[PDB]
Amino acid sequence: ELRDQQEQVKEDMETKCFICGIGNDYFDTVPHGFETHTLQEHNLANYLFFLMYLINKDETEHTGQESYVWKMYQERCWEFFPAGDCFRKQYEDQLN
Amino acid sequence: ELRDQQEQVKEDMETKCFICGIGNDYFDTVPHGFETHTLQEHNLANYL
Amino acid sequence: YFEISESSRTQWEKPQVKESKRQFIFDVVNEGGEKEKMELFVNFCEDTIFEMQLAAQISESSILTVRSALFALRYNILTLMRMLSLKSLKKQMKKVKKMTVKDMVTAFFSSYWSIFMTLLHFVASVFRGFFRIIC
Amino acid sequence: FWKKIIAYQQKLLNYFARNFYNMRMLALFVAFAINFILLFYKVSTIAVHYVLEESSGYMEPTLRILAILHTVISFFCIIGYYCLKVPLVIFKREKEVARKLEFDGLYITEQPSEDDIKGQWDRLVINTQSFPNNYWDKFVKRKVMDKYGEFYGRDRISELLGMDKAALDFSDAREKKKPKKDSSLSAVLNSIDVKYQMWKLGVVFTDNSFLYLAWYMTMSVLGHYNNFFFAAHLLDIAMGFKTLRTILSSVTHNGKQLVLTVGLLAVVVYLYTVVAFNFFRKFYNKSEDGDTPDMKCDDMLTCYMFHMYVGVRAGGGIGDEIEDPAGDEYEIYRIIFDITFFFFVIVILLAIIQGLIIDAFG
Amino acid sequence: TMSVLGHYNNFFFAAHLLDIAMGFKTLRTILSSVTHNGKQLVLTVGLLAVVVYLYTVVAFNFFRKFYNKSEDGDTPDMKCDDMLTCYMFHMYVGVRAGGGIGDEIEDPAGDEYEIYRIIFDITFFFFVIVILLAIIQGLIIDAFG
Numbered sequence: 186e187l188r189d190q191q192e193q194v195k196e197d198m199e200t201k202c203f204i205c206g207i208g209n210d211y212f213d214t215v216p217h218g219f220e221t222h223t224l225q226e227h228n229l230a231n232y233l234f235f236l237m238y239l240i241n242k243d244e245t246e247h248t249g250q251e252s253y254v255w256k257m258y259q260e261r262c263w264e265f266f267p268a269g270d271c272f273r274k275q276y277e278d279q280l281n
Numbered sequence: 282e283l284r285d286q287q288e289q290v291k292e293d294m295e296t297k298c299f300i301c302g303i304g305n306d307y308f309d310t311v312p313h314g315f316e317t318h319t320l321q322e323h324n325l326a327n328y329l
Numbered sequence: 330y331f332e333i334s335e336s337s338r339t340q341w342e343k344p345q346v347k348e349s350k351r352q353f354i355f356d357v358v359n360e361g362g363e364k365e366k367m368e369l370f371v372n373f374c375e376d377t378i379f380e381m382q383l384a385a386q387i388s389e390s391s392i393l394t395v396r397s398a399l400f401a402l403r404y405n406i407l408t409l410m411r412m413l414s415l416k417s418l419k420k421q422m423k424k425v426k427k428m429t430v431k432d433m434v435t436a437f438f439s440s441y442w443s444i445f446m447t448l449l450h451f452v453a454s455v456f457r458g459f460f461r462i463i464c
Numbered sequence: 465f466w467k468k469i470i471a472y473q474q475k476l477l478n479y480f481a482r483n484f485y486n487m488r489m490l491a492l493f494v495a496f497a498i499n500f501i502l503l504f505y506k507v508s509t510i511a512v513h514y515v516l517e518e519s520s521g522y523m524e525p526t527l528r529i530l531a532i533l534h535t536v537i538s539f540f541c542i543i544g545y546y547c548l549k550v551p552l553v554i555f556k557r558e559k560e561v562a563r564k565l566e567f568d569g570l571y572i573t574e575q576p577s578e579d580d581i582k583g584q585w586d587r588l589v590i591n592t593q594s595f596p597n598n599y600w601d602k603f604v605k606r607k608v609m610d611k612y613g614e615f616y617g618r619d620r621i622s623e624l625l626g627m628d629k630a631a632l633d634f635s636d637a638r639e640k641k642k643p644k645k646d647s648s649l650s651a652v653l654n655s656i657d658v659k660y661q662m663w664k665l666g667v668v669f670t671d672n673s674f675l676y677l678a679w680y681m682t683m684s685v686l687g688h689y690n691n692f693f694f695a696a697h698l699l700d701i702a703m704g705f706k707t708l709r710t711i712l713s714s715v716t717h718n719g720k721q722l723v724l725t726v727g728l729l730a731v732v733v734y735l736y737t738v739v740a741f742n743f744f745r746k747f748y749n750k751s752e753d754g755d756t757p758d759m760k761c762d763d764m765l766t767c768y769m770f771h772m773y774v775g776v777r778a779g780g781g782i783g784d785e786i787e788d789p790a791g792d793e794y795e796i797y798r799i800i801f802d803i804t805f806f807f808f809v810i811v812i813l814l815a816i817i818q819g820l821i822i823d824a825f826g
Numbered sequence: 827t828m829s830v831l832g833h834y835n836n837f838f839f840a841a842h843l844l845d846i847a848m849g850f851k852t853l854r855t856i857l858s859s860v861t862h863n864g865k866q867l868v869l870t871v872g873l874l875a876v877v878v879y880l881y882t883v884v885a886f887n888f889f890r891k892f893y894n895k896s897e898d899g900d901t902p903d904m905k906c907d908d909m910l911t912c913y914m915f916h917m918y919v920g921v922r923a924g925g926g927i928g929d930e931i932e933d934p935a936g937d938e939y940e941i942y943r944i945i946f947d948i949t950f951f952f953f954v955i956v957i958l959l960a961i962i963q964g965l966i967i968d969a970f971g
């Protein structure tokens with residue numbers, strides 16, 4: 186069971202996107218769709234570097250989005266994280 | 282098989298609502314959605 | 330869109346952060362609460378940021394077997410190429426041009442037998458090189 | 465005068481390629497025949513002589529005839545493989561070499577990592593004139609020149625792949641027709657790209673199936689020196705049948721875990737041996753005669769070997785073999801020792817190894 | 827036919843107790859489990875017979891002094907002087923024994939071939955008893971399952 190759980194973790198990580206939770210099938214319509222989604226669009230490293238960038242930046246210079254996210258994180262609410270939706274889902278009709 | 286049935290009972294109880302039978306995914310769109318559905322809306326204690 | 334520092338990229342690529350990310354991904358996927366998934370991710374982000382800031386302070390204030398195998402191939406195949414480079418096969422073939430089907434078939438077989446002996450010499454040389462490597 | 469010898473060689477080449485499988489079938493049948501005859505091979509009695517025993521009396525010449533036939537059929541099998549499947553392997557390897565050379569420039573822009581035998585050995589073939597010998601695309605050289613030469617130097621790429629420039633211009637310009645000399649021995653021999661043949665022989669030697677068929681032939685040859693060497697040819701069924709192939713591949717499927725678990729078992733039995741060598745040594749006498757005491761745990765290596773062999777094979781554990789502790793001051797300690805040995809070594813770790821192999825097969 | 831032969835010999839009526847194996851569904855499935863994977867079960871038994879044959883071939887050539895099986899010194903009973911006898915002994919007494927062939931054949935301590943015979947016995951135990959027999963048993967059991 187322990188080995189199966191490790192294998193299931195790896196399979197879930199290769200087939201699911203960690204942030205939005207959408208399936209890789211919805212992204213793999215284009216070649217390397219899931220890889221592009223996990224590298225360019227939703228990336229854990231990018232989110233961590235975003236947090237570092239907001240920590241390092243001065244309050245007065247935050248943009249609108251940066252100030253929104255900063256207040257959201259100060260009050261410890263995680264609505265800004267995409268939940269089941271992405272850019273493609275948001276603009277599906279216009280983009281495609 | 283007996284142990285698996287006990288585990289399946291517990292998993293079904295944590296993932297399904299007993300009264301309406303709708304999946305927890307349909308409720309978990311909001312945070313704590315399934316918990317709110319199982320406590321405020323559909324609760325065995327409340328029915329009793 | 331924002332700016333990512335190259336130093337931040339290097340400290341992310343440092344092995345310690347890689348191990349920490351292994352542990353965090355395993356923990357979250359195996360047992361991390363779905364309602365607490367984002368909370369745990371933000372906590373791990375803060376911990377990793379502090380680990381990066383600590384790693385910065387701390388930091389700034391086989392092939393020989395492939396070599397042997399290639400040499401074995403080169404030497405053992407050049408050994409067979411020496412057979413053609415001697416150029417003395419022409420005098421022998423002067424005799425074969427006038428003799429019969431059985432002997433031409435015999436030479437046909439002899440060529441492949443020589444190839445197989447070349448392969449045996451090659452594999453023996455590979456083994457010997459491996460003994461020298463391990464010793 | 466050679467147009468006949470090439471035709472006859474082609475006929476033999478095609479015959480061997482056509483009947484490669486049937487010869488491999490016949491070799492296995494002969495392998496069963498030799499080993500069935502070898503099943504009536506007794507000792508006769510200084511040196512001991514091994515003689516075939518039978519009532520018919522015609523088994524002995526048959527054993528020589530079958531051995532010679534097997535040795536010939538094996539050689540014919542290697543020949544047939546070289547006729548049939550070697551060209552496919554060469555065509556493939558030559559195709560991926562061109563793919564890497566052109567699309568991502570694995571010998572111009574970026575160099576092989578030097579830890580792969582294939583990339584290092586494929587450097588030789590690009591210089592050879594007789595390139596895509598099997599591959600269809602004969603102008604991969606032209607494509608790489610047009611797509612990389614301006615960046616890396618036209619003449620330098622030309623020397624790296626061994627091209628020539630005057631030939632293209634001459635062929636595009638006016639030319640004449642002149643009958644050739646087929647008798648030219650020097651020209652005929654020099655046309656053979658010895659470097660390309662060197663590369664191809666290297667590829668064939670590195671091929672796994674050719675190595676298997678060479679090992680088969682080696683055992684067939686050694687069978688003449690010793691007839692019992694023909695028993696190794698009964699392992700060919702394990703390759704022929706799919707289920708036996710899967711059974712063998714089950715062991716190698718989890719090789720890393722299987723090695724690690726065996727190492728863990730060897731460490732655990734080593735810790736148990738270390739405890740025994742320090743505390744429980746009087747219980748390891750293994751001689752019935754009182755005059756000569758045979759101690760299996762006076763020496764560290766001897767005690768470890770005994771624990772590895774007689775303790776692991778025994779179903780109950782080490783306590784089934786070593787002497788009973790009743791009445792001794794260390795009774796409870798040795799009871800715990802034996803019980804823990806039985807639980808950890810026999811019950812758990814061996815079961816882990818067996819489960820690894822069985823569930824890999826599954 | 828068994829009913830008729832029971833009159834010639836009364837013990838022939840014991841074969842009629844196999845009719846319950848047809849009457850009851852679970853016993854029918856248990857019997858059908860063997861025939862369910864018949865090809866694989868035959869092939870694996872052949873592989874086992876080949877492996878034990880290779881081990882017997884090695885033993886007949888190198889380790890023969892260890893196969894004496896007589897307590898009385900006057901009459902030495904050798905089970906591996908003959909190829910067929912050694913193979914039969916390895917098939918029977920070696921396969922049935924849980925530990926392996928080394929549980930039955932004589933101890934190698936102090937002999938020049940000590941390490942070789944230790945490896946021989948350990949490999950026999952691992953490949954034959956631990957793996958192949960487990961493969962056969964698993965085939966039958968999981969066919970039933």
Ligand SMILES: Nc1ncnc2c1ncn2[C@@H]1O[C@H](COP(=O)(O)OP(=O)(O)OP(=O)(O)O)[C@@H](O)[C@H]1O
Nearest residue numbers: 198199201202203204219220223224227228229230
């Ligand atoms: N939001 C996400 N951010 C990053 N990777 C994600 C995300 N969602 C899913 N993934 C997947 O998780 C995996 C993370 O990358 P990956 O584990 O391959 O790199 P790594 O951490 O260097 O480890 P390794 O290369 O050794 O597997 C990828 O398969 C990627 O597709």
Ligand SMILES: Nc1ncnc2c1ncn2[C@@H]1O[C@H](COP(=O)(O)OP(=O)(O)OP(=O)(O)O)[C@@H](O)[C@H]1O
Nearest residue numbers: 294295297298299300315316319320323324325326
């Ligand atoms: N209609 C329902 N009413 C109540 N709980 C429901 C209902 N449908 C599903 N559930 C789920 O069944 C479980 C019942 O609560 P839970 O078993 O946690 O409390 P408990 O009876 O005190 O036992 P314990 O806390 O020891 O598990 C919860 O996980 C709840 O989400």
Ligand SMILES: [Zn+2]
Nearest residue numbers: 202204205227
């Ligand atoms: Zn995503």
Ligand SMILES: [Zn+2]
Nearest residue numbers: 298300301323
């Ligand atoms: Zn409900």
